C-alpha cells in the first residue's frame, strides 16, 4: 500500500508544518505536526482541559465507532523546546494520504503546556522516530509508520518540505519526480531512538568545504538547524552585524542583510540551504533585528538537522531492517 499527503507551513516563517490526518469512524480530520524526532501520536481531544484548548480541532473518541480505550495506559512527554503534554490512550483507525492503519494508539491529551495551547494551527503531533521512544505506559505503543510498514510497498517514508510553500509526506514509495540527481544514502544509528546520522562537513556561502564529522538527527519537528558552536560561529561571521544575543536566545542579524548559503555534506554529496531559508524575520514586530535559522546546539546535547536543513532536500527515511537516511537535492 502507499500513502501521500500534503504538508503545509503553519505561518509565513515555516515555523512548523501540518498534515491532515483522519482519525476514527466516521473520520475526524486533525492537522498534525509530523515529527521524526518523537514517537507519540497525540491529539487535542474532548478530554483536554478546556482552558488549555484555544482554537484547535479536537478528537472526540465517543463519536468514533472504532475507538477503544486502551485500559490502564497513560502517556506523558516533554520536548526539547520545554513544551509538554500528557493523557490517556485510545486505539482507533488512522489514515494519512489514503494509507490506513487499524488499531493505532491515539494518545488523548488531558493536559498540554502553554506553547501548544497558544498555537491554534496544530491539533497534535504524529511521531515518526523509532518506537523505542514512545512514552505510553505500562505497554509501549508503536508509531504509525511502524504499524503500517509491513503493508507498505516499500518500508520507507519520505519528507519533502517546502520553503514558504506546501510539500509532501509519502509512505511506501519514492517519487522519482520529486528530486534532481541521485539520492545519497547514509548510515543511521537507532541507539538513541532517533534518525541519527553523521554529516561529512559543511561550507559557508562560496567558501571551501570543511570535511568534519557532525553527528545529528533528522528532525522534522524542529524548526531550525542546530550545529556545533564552531560551525555556527563560522557561518554568522560572514554576516555583517550578526551577533549571539543572550537576551534574545540566539544569533540575530540585521534585517537588511543578505544571508549566505550553508552547505552540508551527505557522504560525498552536498545539500545547499539557500541564504533566504536561514532568515526567520524580526525578533519582534517592527524590529530591525532578525532571528537566524542556524543556531548553536551547545545547550541541547545533540545536533539537529531540523526544517531549515531538511526543506532544502528530498529526504528518505528508510525503515528497512537496517535503517538508513537518503538525501537528494530538489
Curated annotation (Swiss-Prot):
GO biological process: proteolysis
The UniProt record lists the keyword Disulfide bond: yes
Family: Belongs to the peptidase A1 family.
Active site per database record: 35, 199
Entry EC number(s): 3.4.23.22
Catalytic activity entry: Hydrolysis of proteins with specificity similar to that of pepsin A, prefers hydrophobic residues at P1 and P1', but does not cleave 14-Ala-|-Leu-15 in the B chain of insulin or Z-Glu-Tyr. Clots milk
Disulfide bond sites: 255-290
UniProt-recorded name of the protein: Endothiapepsin
Peptidase A1 domain residues: 17-328
Name of the gene: EAPA
Alphabetized UniProt keyword annotations: Aspartyl protease, Disulfide bond, Hydrolase, Protease, Signal, Zymogen
EC top class, as a word: hydrolase
Highest rank taxon of the organism: Eukaryota
Gene Ontology MF terms in the entry: aspartic-type endopeptidase activity
